[PDB]
Amino acid sequence: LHKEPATLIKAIDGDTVKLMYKGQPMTFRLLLVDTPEFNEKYGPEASAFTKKMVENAKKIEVEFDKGQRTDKYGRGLAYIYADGKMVNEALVRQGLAKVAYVYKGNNTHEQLARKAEAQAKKEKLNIWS
Numbered sequence: 001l002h003k004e005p006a007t008l009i010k011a012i013d014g015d016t017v018k019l020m021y022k023g024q025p026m027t028f029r030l031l032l033v034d035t036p037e038f039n040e041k042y043g044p045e046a047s048a049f050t051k052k053m054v055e056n057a058k059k060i061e062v063e064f065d066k067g068q069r070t071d072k073y074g075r076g077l078a079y080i081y082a083d084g085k086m087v088n089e090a091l092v093r094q095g096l097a098k099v100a101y102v103y104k105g106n107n108t109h110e111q112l113a114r115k116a117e118a119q120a121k122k123e124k125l126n127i128w129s
């Protein structure tokens with residue numbers, strides 16, 4: 001997989017962010033994760049965690065997987081990095097997202113994500129408390 005440049009337009013919620021990619025505004029939905037909705041338990045904390053990660057980043061990067069790059073809503077599907085740290089994995093490691101929506105061919109980082117969930121679970125963090 002390859003990391004590509006993007007710039008933050010605005011945080012949206014725990015698992016979607018608006019970025020400018022190849023000069024076009026796009027909503028990205030993070031691969032392999034599911035955060036609670038803002039109205040749900042840990043939803044505000046998830047939104048906060050992602051917002052802080054992307055707003056504080058000097059460099060945001062988009063990494064597409066091998067499969068579908070847009071979902072049925074027109075959202076980009078990618079792993080998003082903030083100064084080299086994957087947001088998708090970070091949310092899971094903190095117990096603020098579950099591994100989810102794992103579809104064959106867009107699952108390169110599935111094992112990394114599941115390993116993070118296991119650790120978050122063993123720690124009883126947030127969703128796992």
Ligand SMILES: Cc1cn([C@H]2C[C@H](OP(=O)(O)O)[C@@H](COP(=O)(O)O)O2)c(=O)[nH]c1=O
Nearest residue numbers: 029030031032033034071072077101103106
């Ligand atoms: C993460 C992801 C979501 N989706 C679609 C599946 C779900 O369809 P449905 O809307 O019919 O439930 C929706 C959930 O996204 P959200 O968790 O943002 O609601 O996004 C993909 O198709 N591929 C993906 O990789």
Ligand SMILES: [Ca+2]
Nearest residue numbers: 015034035036
């Ligand atoms: Ca969600």
